[PDB]
Amino acid sequence: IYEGQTVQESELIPQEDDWVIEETNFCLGRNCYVRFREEDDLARRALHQMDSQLNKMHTRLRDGTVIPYMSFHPDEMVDRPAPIHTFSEKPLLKWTWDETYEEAYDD
Amino acid sequence: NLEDHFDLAEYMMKMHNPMSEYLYWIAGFVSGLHGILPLLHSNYYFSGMFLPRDNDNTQLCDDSW
Amino acid sequence: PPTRLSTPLYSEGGAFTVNWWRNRYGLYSRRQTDPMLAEFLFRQQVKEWFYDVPSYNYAALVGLALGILVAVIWRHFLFNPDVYVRRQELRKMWPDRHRQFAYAVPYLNPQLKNLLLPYKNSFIDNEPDYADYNPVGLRPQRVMAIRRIPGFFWAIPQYFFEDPLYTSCSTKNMQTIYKKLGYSEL
Amino acid sequence: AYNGGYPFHYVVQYDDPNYDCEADFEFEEIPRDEFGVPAHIPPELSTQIRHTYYVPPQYYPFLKKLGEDTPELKPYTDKLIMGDMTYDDYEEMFYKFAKPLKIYRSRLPLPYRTDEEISQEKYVNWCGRWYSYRQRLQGDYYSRHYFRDWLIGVMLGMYLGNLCVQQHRQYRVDMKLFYLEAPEHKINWVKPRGDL
Amino acid sequence: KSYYDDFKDRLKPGKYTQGRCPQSEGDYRQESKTIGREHLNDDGTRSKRYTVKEADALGYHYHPPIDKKGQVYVKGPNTVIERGQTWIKGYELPSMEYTYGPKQEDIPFYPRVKLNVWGNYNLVMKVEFLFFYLPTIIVFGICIPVYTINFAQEEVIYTTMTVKVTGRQWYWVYEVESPT
Amino acid sequence: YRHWHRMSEDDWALPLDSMPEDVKTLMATPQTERGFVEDYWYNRIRGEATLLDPEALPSKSYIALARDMGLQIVDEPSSHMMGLIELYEYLRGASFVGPFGTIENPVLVPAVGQERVVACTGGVGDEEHFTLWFRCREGFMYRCGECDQIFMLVRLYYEDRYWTQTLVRDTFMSDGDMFDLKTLERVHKMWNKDEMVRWEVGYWAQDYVLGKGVLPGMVEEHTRVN
Amino acid sequence: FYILVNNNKRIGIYYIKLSIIIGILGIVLSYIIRVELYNSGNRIIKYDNVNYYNMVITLHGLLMIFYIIMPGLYGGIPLYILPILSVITDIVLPRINNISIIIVLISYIVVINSIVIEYNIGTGWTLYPPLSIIGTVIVNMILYGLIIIGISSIISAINFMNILIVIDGIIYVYIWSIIITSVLLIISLPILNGILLMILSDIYFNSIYFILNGDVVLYQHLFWYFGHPEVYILILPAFGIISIILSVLNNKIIFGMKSMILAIIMISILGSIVWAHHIYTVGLELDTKIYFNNLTLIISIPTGNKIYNWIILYIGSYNILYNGYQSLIFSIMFIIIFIIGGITGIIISIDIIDIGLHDTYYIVSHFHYILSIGAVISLLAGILLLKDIIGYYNVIIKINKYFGLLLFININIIFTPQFIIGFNVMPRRILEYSDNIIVWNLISSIGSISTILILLSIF
């Protein structure tokens, strides 16, 4: 069964005595029904909807990396509402292994 | 085109003509009538009344109404 | 479960083994396009399914259910008098089907029926032995059990000699009561 | 080892220049293979025959130059010069000198991150490890707490179930006394009504 | 505070029911004559000509997008060169106030936390075992009673009287042996 | 690749009937202005003209020889672009498995657009977790919230176009000295004489240069019934 | 276009839309029943028109199963998200997907037209002969609908099975539920078609299979051989939805994924060999009854494992997250309701207990708790979870605690009394009844009228 990543004792040693877990808010903000503008026509309302996607949002950490919106299933990865053609580029399921080949490295 | 990105773009962008919704509700209403209208028609055909009076097939008191 | 493709997987000989499974797993697969990738996907499936402890519980259940299913099907054909496969008896009128009638009585007296019928008194409160006696002789005479059925029968005492009213409700006592009145023979 | 040994594409030759396998409906021409083997010589015989490529001798100086500049290529070029290169030898030469494309990570543009952020990488990794440490410990803690709590439901279910056991227990006692003592039980009482 | 008051101005109450004037006052069914809007109706919805009567998927207005070199227009990233490195600045979505309306302030705090997972493999395996076999034990407890009661139904009895019952539409017929 | 179908006949060579009839202009067109069919015949006519001249091959440098055959000399820029193209093509119908991604070596996620959906499955063995899908957009160093694996999007983009084999050739290959039609004629007479045509592309090419239907048998070759 | 569209997501919407429309007729038929059963004596159906009531129950059962719940759970949600849950773009067989929804509509039009034009008589949704083969042409029309519906079901099953070939990701638990349901259809539908043809042969071709010397019980075996897999085909997609909702809304990985998958597989295998618990009262052999009774109880073992795995998904979830969302409430309500329906199923699995409870309203309540509450609520829960993806609006259902509470209270009022009535006893498929069962029937009737009013509040 999965019980999280394994941690070694040395990995828990801080480089400063004042380090504490970062208090970054992972609440993306306050939302409601997407509110369109009467002036926007069909094309521009589509742009408005595409700019309100929660799955395009993320939280930036203190080192510049971002933790994105993540889901257990790919149903939450398409634009909401679902467009006619969703996965133009095949989603990549990344597996990890310890195998390696010499061609990838250079000395 | 941007207009074609979303399926049923007019409805999803909240510009659709309301008549589409009315037809959907009307279609549902007509479907419901297929249970009520033949009931009335069949009752009249075999009894001559659209609907019975409650307990009219049983013995009733003199003052029953 | 090894994590390096260099370490081999132990396999036994036979028709259901790691080697046997590897040979057939990727027959219809479009994803196992080379040895490295094929082995990785093979071990991924084996790890996920065969190293899952709770999965073995379902393996036991399917075996038991199928075993019963095959036995009942086979028993009907072999022993049930009403089931015909040969045609000799079906080409004769009913009174002449002597060979088929040979199945009737033995098929009427399976072991489990004899064992469990005496335990009717765990359900019936009055006259649990009303049908025990039958002079014809097609079946054995029944004798009521002396203990309750194991399990969920906490309503009645563990043994019937602990029940003060058990003997009074027997078919014999009721027959005595009604005979004394001339009410009925049974 | 694919398609039963039949290649998807292969060359066919005809002796008559004006021959068309689709227009003509004659029955004398015999097609040849890429090496020129007539069709009425079966492949199990023709494949045994050794066919080698013959280049015009004017190409020998060029083939010599290729071998000298690339010594690993010399043995194949020598076979070609000496008329000892079969199709299989050519294939071995072809695939021996095929190399894979190289991707250089140093040429990939990176997502923008300020210098101050780049100095906080160790801190963020440190926080991540503590989250995993806290996560793993909590799993043991929660598993003990909730699975233990399930026992309360078992005990609660047993008690409530036992209430119905007692009711059933009393019910069986009552039934045993109905035919023996209960005045509600009556005999020589019900008389046939008769047909209306 | 009331967050609705922040974007009250954007929401002007409507005039017509369902957003359209009567067709007599304005014919929203006709295609728009505005240049570059030939595929839209006056009210902005897609015209039937564009989507149905002359749909491109049916062979109307054939116009292959790809060019001779097998290329299509692609918009590049926002590249920046600094500190001896080429960087790409990602596109950040606009503030949720612009798209949704509420002002993004006083947001409740929700911290980062890794997945809630059950631990103690040894304990968990026993729980999974119980989930399977506790129901199995209950089934076994029922099995023996089931066999017994089934045998009671089919027990051979020394009956002395026969009543034949025939069901007919819609009444019951009873045949009994008349005493001699 | 495994997800490609059988090679077509055209995948090996093109029929001579597809040769452009204005050969004189074809051999003078810059590479950036040649279409797929025009580029194919430019390389085949020029490539076979040099290969069918044995006496000149030994004195010709590999750079010149590669240019005549239309082969692109590999360099780190071109190699990088081609490598990422093949990786993108391979991943169309193949699994995505590789080493664990870190800040120093982020997982590379090739894409043509600005976004591509990716899943993180953690590390190996016990470190593997349930799939966590996210939208990988350009310009952000993505960090899995569970295992802290680092992902990055690589875009196959160049000057309002996406990387392709032809795009790489045009950007880096440089047209050499203009092809001389005298070489075509000289090689043509070498291998084509007295009704024997062992250099047929040149025979057709030379006929087009002379107009059309000038050389023996070419009128009959170009006359068709349907 | 609107009818020519092949997009699977559009077709998924059409399945949901069509099920709601047909649902109204099913609800009307259901409402006619409870109004009549308010008290003894005729209320809205004449005594001389009792045949109409038999048609109402026959259509209520048929429409709700084949035209409402099955398209909603097996056609609607799966066609929308299944290709998304897989990494593929669209459904494998686009043109087949289009014709399947059109076929469902045409069969519906045939059925309702038969109500209007043919004489109205009924034989139950199970169409037991000889009653089914001595009826009028309305029975012929209903058979055509079922056969036509069978075509759509099988081709849709073929469509989903092809996902195994093209799936570019992991086979999630939900995908397994749809795949195994397709397998059940493939193995059970051809048997159904064969026996239905025999019914037509007797009705229309002077066949004599269902007259003396021809065993009428033959039909019951073949029908229920498909009948019980059908109920498991209805519920298995509901199980898949619950697994997704609970995991997603609690941010917890699905526990015992393989155990869940194997439980679904086990249920299908067991569900295909237990059909004869519908035939206990016909007089089967002693050993036959013992076998089916024993194997029927075994179905609880895999079904129980799924229940417990669901419970641990909800346990321990973060308190800060709001738990009043309608989708979450419905998913939790399903566990509570399904347990009630399943436990009563185990009670009526014991054949001697079933002798008293066959053809009684106890059986009605049994399958209503599972289907009318559980399956509907699962379908509602799934649609609510996908509200943003689907994009529908103009309803107040996402956060509506009144609707959830009122629905739960009132549906329980309808069907809890029907358990009690079963022991009283009241037979099924009955219009009149003895005066001493009025109280319980009256309470359920009040429940039915109340539920219909609640539906009007969502708009």
Ligand SMILES: CCCCCCCCCCCCCCCCCC(=O)OC[C@H](COP(=O)([O-])OCC(O)COP(=O)([O-])OC[C@@H](COC(=O)CCCCCCCCCCCCCCCCC)OC(=O)CCCCCCCCCCCCCCCCC)OC(=O)CCCCCCCCCCCCCCCCC
């Ligand atoms: C179970 C219930 C409870 C459920 C609760 C839970 C629900 C949860 C939520 C579920 C949500 C699921 C997902 C939803 C996704 C929605 C996507 C969407 O909107 O897609 C866009 C889609 C289309 O939008 P669009 O893209 O703009 O389309 C443009 C058109 O294509 C092009 O535009 P156009 O204008 O050109 O259109 C052409 C138009 C042309 O229009 C016109 O010309 C109209 C003219 C006016 C006609 C009006 C009707 C007249 C009737 C007269 C009756 C007289 C009776 C007299 C009686 C006399 C008695 C004495 O029509 C036609 O030409 C053909 C019409 C054919 C269809 C209608 C048929 C009607 C019934 C016919 C019955 C015949 C019976 C004969 C029987 C005979 C037997 C022998 O929307 C719709 O179609 C409407 C959908 C509305 C519902 C949306 C969902 C909302 C949430 C649910 C609400 C609750 C519903 C409850 C059920 C209903 C109860 C009644």
Ligand SMILES: CCCCCCCCCCCCCCCCCC(=O)OC[C@H](COP(=O)([O-])OCC(O)COP(=O)([O-])OC[C@@H](COC(=O)CCCCCCCCCCCCCCCCC)OC(=O)CCCCCCCCCCCCCCCCC)OC(=O)CCCCCCCCCCCCCCCCC
């Ligand atoms: C004395 C007699 C001795 C006889 C000896 C006979 C020996 C025979 C040797 C047979 C060896 C088989 C070798 C092939 C293995 C399968 C490989 C495979 O399918 O490759 C994928 C291959 C696609 O290639 P791919 O790209 O590699 O796929 C990637 C995955 O999609 C991506 O997925 P992923 O990577 O996330 O996961 C990988 C894997 C994940 O799944 C697995 O790895 C599953 C592994 C277990 C499979 C079962 C093995 C047997 C277990 C023992 C059972 C013993 C019973 C004993 C009873 C005895 C009673 C007397 O995915 C699949 O396997 C997908 C296909 C699953 C199809 C399941 C269909 C339902 C069948 C029931 C399920 C099995 C239940 C077993 C019992 C459970 C209770 C204990 O699938 C296809 O080509 C799909 C074709 C679909 C055709 C459908 C229509 C067929 C006609 C239907 C007729 C009616 C059927 C009725 C069925 C009733 C069921 C209850």
Ligand SMILES: CCCCCCCCCCCCCCCCCC(=O)OC[C@H](COP(=O)([O-])OCC(O)COP(=O)([O-])OC[C@@H](COC(=O)CCCCCCCCCCCCCCCCC)OC(=O)CCCCCCCCCCCCCCCCC)OC(=O)CCCCCCCCCCCCCCCCC
């Ligand atoms: C060797 C011998 C040779 C012999 C030769 C003999 C030859 C004989 C020929 C025999 C074949 C004849 C038929 C050929 C068909 C050709 C098809 C074709 O190529 O069409 C191209 C053609 C393209 O059209 P177009 O010329 O480009 O113009 C289209 C428009 O411009 C705009 O394009 P569009 O496609 O968007 O517009 C179409 C659509 C656009 O309009 C809309 O969609 C309106 C907006 C939606 C409103 C909401 C509707 C409700 C929600 C439904 C959700 C599920 C939808 C499922 C998918 C659609 C299914 C139809 O409106 C309609 O067509 C009507 C839509 C009806 C929807 C029905 C939904 C369920 C209704 C439930 C009723 C409940 C009450 C029960 C009682 C009544 C029962 C009938 O197809 C069509 O668009 C029209 C199809 C019309 C034929 C439909 C026939 C249906 C028959 C039903 C059975 C009736 C029998 C019983 C009667 C009972 C009466 C009471």
Ligand code: HEA
């Ligand atoms: C979705 C629909 C659905 C579902 C899931 C079920 C599921 C089950 N059904 Fe049901 N059934 C119907 C729909 C359904 N049924 C219908 C429509 C009829 C009537 C048809 C007609 O006559 O017209 C019917 C009829 C019916 C009958 C009577 C048939 C007759 O004689 O008329 C029986 C008898 O045993 C039965 C049993 C079961 C059982 C044992 C399950 C099992 O799957 C239930 C298992 C679930 C549980 C037991 C609860 C969960 C488990 C636990 C909480 C822990 C373990 C529990 C124990 C070990 C007890 N069903």
Ligand code: HEA
């Ligand atoms: C899916 C199947 C289904 C559903 C939902 C229902 C729903 C209801 N049913 Fe039932 N019913 C059956 C299937 C169903 N039924 C079957 C198969 C029989 C046996 C037939 C026979 O006797 O031969 C039967 C029999 C039956 C009888 C016995 C008839 C008789 O023997 O005389 C009665 C009596 O009251 C009854 C009542 C009800 C009521 C009051 C509701 C509902 O009102 C309960 C509450 C529900 C609502 C208020 C509507 C909620 C909305 C929907 C259900 C649609 C949702 C649609 C989408 C989400 C797309 N049903």
Ligand SMILES: CCCCCCCC/C=C/CCCCCCCC(=O)OC[C@H](COP(=O)(O)OCCN)OC(=O)CCCCCCC/C=C/CCCCCCCC
């Ligand atoms: C003798 C005593 C008689 C007593 C009779 C009592 C009758 C009581 C009736 C109670 C039930 C009332 C049900 C009301 C249903 C309302 C349905 C509804 O809201 O429909 C919505 C739906 C969609 O609208 P919106 O969603 O707002 O779309 C705009 C964009 N959003 O609206 C429509 O489609 C409007 C039209 C729908 C059809 C309604 C009319 C149908 C015909 C009814 C005929 C009645 C005849 C009665 C004869 C009586 C003779 C004595």
Ligand SMILES: CCCCCCCC/C=C\CCCCCCCC(=O)OC[C@H](COP(=O)(O)OCCN)OC(=O)CCCCCCC/C=C/CCCCCCCC
């Ligand atoms: C269905 C009838 C078809 C007739 C076909 C005729 C051709 C015969 C050869 C092919 C069919 C195989 C049967 C051959 C039987 C040969 C011996 C024989 O005559 O047996 C008769 C005997 C009974 O005949 P009677 O004496 O009249 O009845 C006595 C009381 N019951 O028949 C049998 O017992 C055998 C019939 C069944 C054979 C098939 C196997 C039975 C078990 C099936 C189990 C199915 C579940 C799954 C199994 C999984 C296995 C991995």
Ligand SMILES: CCCCCCCC/C=C\CCCCCCCC(=O)OC[C@H](COP(=O)(O)OCCN)OC(=O)CCCCCCC/C=C/CCCCCCCC
């Ligand atoms: C006594 C009569 C009993 C009832 C008889 C009903 C008819 C027989 C049963 C239904 C026949 C159809 C079965 C399904 C066929 C296989 C379907 C399938 O998946 O095939 C796929 C393939 C198409 O794939 P694409 O969608 O184009 O994919 C494109 C991307 N690659 O299917 C086809 O080509 C199907 C072509 C024929 C249509 C079949 C489906 C529609 C239903 C036909 C019903 C015919 C009724 C005839 C009744 C006659 C009664 C005497």
Ligand SMILES: CCCCCCCC/C=C\CCCCCCCC(=O)O[C@H](COC(=O)CCCCCCC/C=C/CCCCCCCC)COP(=O)(O)OCCN
């Ligand atoms: C090339 C491919 C060929 C495939 C062919 C497949 C053939 C089988 C297809 C399914 C149909 C099964 C046959 C129908 C069996 C009905 C038997 C029946 O009803 O008999 C019962 C008695 O039957 C039983 O005892 C019940 C046994 C259950 C039989 C089930 C057989 C089919 C099971 C299919 C399940 C799905 C496949 C599972 C595969 C393995 C899973 C691990 C009636 O008994 P009584 O009326 O009392 O009469 C007795 C004497 N007067």
Ligand SMILES: [O-][O-]
């Ligand atoms: O059917 O249960």
Ligand SMILES: [Cu+2]
């Ligand atoms: Cu059943």
Ligand SMILES: [K+]
């Ligand atoms: K009544």
Ligand SMILES: [Zn+2]
């Ligand atoms: Zn991860």
